[PDB]
Design an enzyme around this catalytic site. Structure first.
Site, PDB file in Angstrom:
ATOM      1  N   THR A 381       0.731  -1.080  -0.033  1.00  0.00           N
ATOM      2  CA  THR A 381       0.191   0.208   0.110  1.00  0.00           C
ATOM      3  C   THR A 381       1.247   1.450   0.010  1.00  0.00           C
ATOM      4  O   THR A 381       0.593   2.875  -0.534  1.00  0.00           O
ATOM      5  CB  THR A 381      -1.048   0.303   1.252  1.00  0.00           C
ATOM      6  OG1 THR A 381       0.159   0.140   2.315  1.00  0.00           O
ATOM      7  CG2 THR A 381      -1.809  -1.144   1.132  1.00  0.00           C
ATOM      8  N   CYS A 382       1.875   1.199   0.942  1.00  0.00           N
ATOM      9  CA  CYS A 382       3.094   2.470   0.512  1.00  0.00           C
ATOM     10  C   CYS A 382       3.521   2.992  -0.779  1.00  0.00           C
ATOM     11  O   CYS A 382       3.997   3.624  -1.242  1.00  0.00           O
ATOM     12  CB  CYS A 382       4.767   1.809   0.875  1.00  0.00           C
ATOM     13  SG  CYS A 382       4.743  -0.417   1.321  1.00  0.00           S
TER      14      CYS A 382
END
Ligand code: NA
Length: 408
Positions: A381-382
């Protein structure tokens, strides 16, 4: 105000001010968030988000005291004005219908509360107050500041922030503070996982994973001046054995998500619970709670498609054809959920998918070929990245993709 000014305090101050100008514009965009039309009972249990929302709503109506409360504030002193009134009210009266009186401004009382909730949900992020900070670049990945204590009223402030978020939920209004999924996990009493570390501290996530030829470690953690902390009773004495580690990894992960924020989060959760008991959120997973609080948006499919980037894959690749088709098949709420899976949030910036932000900064929605046909899809998700195994069929992809997504 509170903390002396660091070079990085100055930086964060400017971001916040810019955010205020931007926010002034941003309301039109915020006003087209939605959930569901009202209903009181929600009917028969059906595992769906719709049912859960109604059931919750129902609890809020049923336990509502009648008549109303006046919250009186000035536009330029919104934070301070709101705080006093709210804190001096008795939490159950905050369940009554909210009349927000903006001083000097005169019909749409729903419209005014909506703007008030939005504004206030940004005002709490003000780098003065020292309540929050960001883990990534710019305003990526909100979290409670471990050094909130610099502000000596910080616990009261956290308690107020708790009542404020309970009121948004209780009166069905949306906020835009930017809390992360692990923060919602904690309001639901779910334990955040190792996977969840990657969302907030990817390099810390890597070290935990690497953790037999490996250096000297102790069931203790160093957190910053400095003060080291026990990680269980007399941990300094307790050597972590390069083969006796679960106790370490678990307790570590748990500690990464509770380092120096224990009283602040406690205080936030007591504030919430006074207004709307946490028990009422029992049916929700952390993505559904985010949704309750932030509101659904219509995901524009074509905006998504245009601003997607690939790795070892083109738009022509067979797996991606299959992906988009499945996404098209999905209703809006499943599109949001896929969005939350891949990016860690249901919030999309102002312009849409081109502006997407990661830890490192500008970072568009990405899909790479990386899996093992037997593996489910996975996300980072980073980096707003979907690892999509090169599946051998539409139904193979569709099952797996749908599974990973509604998974919890
Ligand atoms: Na993201």
């Amino acid at each position: 105000t509170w903390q002396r000014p660091t070079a990085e305090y100055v930086r964060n101050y400017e971001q916040w001010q810019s955010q205020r100008n931007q926010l002034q514009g941003a309301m039109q965009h915020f006003s087209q968030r939605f959930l569901y039309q009202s209903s009181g009972s929600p009917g028969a249990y059906d595992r769906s988000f719709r049912w859960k929302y109604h059931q919750f709503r129902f609890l809020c109506h049923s336990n509502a005291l009648p008549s109303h409360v006046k919250i009186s504030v000035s536009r330029q002193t919104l934070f301070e004005d709101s705080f006093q009134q709210i804190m001096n009210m008795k939490p159950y009266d905050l369940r009554r219908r909210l009349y927000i009186i903006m001083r000097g401004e005169e019909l749409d009382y729903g419209g005014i509360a909506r703007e008030w909730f939005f504004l206030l949900s940004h005002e709490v992020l003000n780098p003065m107050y020292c309540l929050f900070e960001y883990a990534g670049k710019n305003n990526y990945c909100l979290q409670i500041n471990p050094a909130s204590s610099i502000n000596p009223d910080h616990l009261t402030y956290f308690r107020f922030i708790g009542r404020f978020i309970a009121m948004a939920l209780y009166h069905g209004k949306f906020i835009d503070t930017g809390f992360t999924l692990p923060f919602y996990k904690r309001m639901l009493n779910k334990r955040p996982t190792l996977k969840d570390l990657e969302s907030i501290d990817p390099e810390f996530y890597n070290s935990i994973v690497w953790i037999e030829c490996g250096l000297e470690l102790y069931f203790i953690q160093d957190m910053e001046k400095v003060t080291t902390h026990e990680l269980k009773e007399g941990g300094e004495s307790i050597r972590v054995t390069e083969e006796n580690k679960e106790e370490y990894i678990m307790l570590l992960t748990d500690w990464r998500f509770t380092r120096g924020v224990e009283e602040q989060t406690k205080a936030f959760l007591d504030g919430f619970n006074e207004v709307a008991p946490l028990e009422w959120l029992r049916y929700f997973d952390e993505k559904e709670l985010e949704l309750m609080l932030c509101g659904m948006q219509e995901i524009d499919m074509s905006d998504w498609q245009k601003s997607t980037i690939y790795r070892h894959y083109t738009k022509n690749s067979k797996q991606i054809q299959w992906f988009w088709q499945v996404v098209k098949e999905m209703d809006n709420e499943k599109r949001i959920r896929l969005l939350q899976f891949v990016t860690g949030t249901c919030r999309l910036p102002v312009g849409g998918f081109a502006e997407l932000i990661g830890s490192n900064g500008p970072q568009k929605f990405c899909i790479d070929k990386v899996g093992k046909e037997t593996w489910l899809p996975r996300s980072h998700t980073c980096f707003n990245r979907l690892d999509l195994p090169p599946y051998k069929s539409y139904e193979q992809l569709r099952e797996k993709l749908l599974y990973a997504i509604e998974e919890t």
